[PDB]
């Protein structure tokens, strides 16, 4: 059974002290308790081993404590680059009784940041085939809530767009977002203005970026 971690997710501001707990049923064998940090898209990284010893190069803001069945990871001055899922891992004997905790997500709150917006028309190569993708990019905003609306010749679109979002940025805690509008070449060629309108609490009114085909 995975060891128990608490909470499942938490958020605090830059500079705050936060604590993550790890609890097991059996007592740990010979201080075999370590803590891993996993950033998006990346392998976990060992931050602390044998309960309280820091990996070389890990900043001193991380510390580990506890014993037996109850362990704590503390981050004493939360930074944007600490956005990650943290896992404890333990050994209870020397013959195969070892497991991970369920993970705890850490998010970092910061001030509002408005996105800067970019729009891309379909490339000529893609237009050579029968498909046309239009891409709207929202860069470096906070918080994550954002409405992207596509308009073609001022007609609103639904069902032909998809978005995805990065994780919180290591340097400035912002998100970035891409929205892709998919049309057929035939429908693309019938129309002239392509626009994406962005609504975000950092902008006093919605921002529209657009292009005229050709």
């Amino acid at each position: 059974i995975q060891m128990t971690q608490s909470p499942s997710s938490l958020s605090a501001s830059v500079g705050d002290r936060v604590t993550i707990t790890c609890q097991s049923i059996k007592s740990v064998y010979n201080n075999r308790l370590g803590w891993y940090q996993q950033k998006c898209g990346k392998a976990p990284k060992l931050l602390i081993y044998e309960t309280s010893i820091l990996t070389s190069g890990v900043p001193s803001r991380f510390s580990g404590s506890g014993s037996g069945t109850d362990f704590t990871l503390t981050i004493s001055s939360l930074q944007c680059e600490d956005f990650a899922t943290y896992y404890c891992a333990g050994g209870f004997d020397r013959s195969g009784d070892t497991t991970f905790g369920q993970g705890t997500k850490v998010e970092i709150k910061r001030t509002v940041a408005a996105p800067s917006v970019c729009i891309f028309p379909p490339s000529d190569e893609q237009l050579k085939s029968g498909t046309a993708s239009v891409v709207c990019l929202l860069n470096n905003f906070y918080p994550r809530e954002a409405k992207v609306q596509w308009k073609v010749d001022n007609a609103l679109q639904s069902g032909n767009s998809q978005e995805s979002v990065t994780c919180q940025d290591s340097k400035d805690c912002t998100y970035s977002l891409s929205s892709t509008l998919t049309l057929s070449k035939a429908d693309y060629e019938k129309h002239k203005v392509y626009a994406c309108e962005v609504t975000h609490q950092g902008l006093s009114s919605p921002v529209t970026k657009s292009f005229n085909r050709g």
């Binding site: 891992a89 085939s129 979002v165």
Partner: protein
């Protein structure tokens, strides 16, 4: 020192999955290698491991479907997972315990970057790579590919890292993946801009020039 993982990427149900983890550089360490997997959106799960004495350990769930071994002549560690189903879809990681322990997770000081495995009936398909042409924004659209990973996007062959955002892929209503990689650059950049895209399951290697 790097643990280089290799594997087929997209596999069909009931096949045997074969992964390798090759130690790419000499280490004077008598180290152990542990295998761990992470299903999409879930946590880390121990599969098993191999000690400095080659003592091979297996998680209770893997004891009957996994074989773990080492080929010392190639410093290559192997994992075989038999009769896969869609539930074996996950990122598979190899990691090193510097103490030589084959059954320990508290001190994995060095990790491979993971090899993505998708168990599915659907056919592999390589991506098309399209420039997204214009501070300023530029990038590449990797479109219409299956399975999702392993997929690699670099800029200028690694030279351009600051400001680059490669987005998670989305499953399109066509049933194929699409993603974009973008970088914000100085507004009056003329500079050569190459995105390097590798979709290993389809043997697709494309370098694409993004010009004004």
């Amino acid at each position: 020192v790097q643990l280089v993982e290799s594997g087929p990427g997209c596999v069909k149900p009931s096949e045997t999955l074969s992964l390798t983890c090759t130690v790419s550089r000499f280490s004077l360490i008598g180290y152990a290698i542990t295998w761990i997997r992470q299903p999409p959106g879930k946590g880390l799960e121990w599969i098993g491991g191999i000690s400095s004495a080659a003592t091979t350990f297996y998680s209770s769930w893997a004891k009957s479907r996994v074989t773990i071994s080492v080929d010392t002549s190639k410093n290559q560690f192997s994992l075989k997972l038999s009769s896969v189903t869609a539930a074996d879809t996950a990122v598979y990681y190899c990691a090193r315990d510097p103490r030589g322990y084959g059954a320990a997770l508290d001190r994995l000081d060095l990790w491979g970057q993971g090899t993505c495995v998708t168990v599915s009936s659907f056919s592999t398909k390589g991506p098309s790579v399209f420039p997204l042409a214009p501070t300023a924004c530029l990038g590449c659209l990797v479109k219409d590919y299956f399975c999702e990973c392993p997929v690699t996007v670099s800029w200028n062959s690694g030279a351009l890292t600051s400001g680059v955002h490669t987005f998670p892929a989305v499953l399109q209503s066509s049933g194929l993946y699409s993603l974009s990689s973008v970088v914000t650059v100085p507004s009056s950049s003329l500079q050569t801009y190459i995105c390097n895209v590798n979709h290993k399951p389809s043997n697709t290697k494309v370098d694409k020039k993004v010009e004004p």
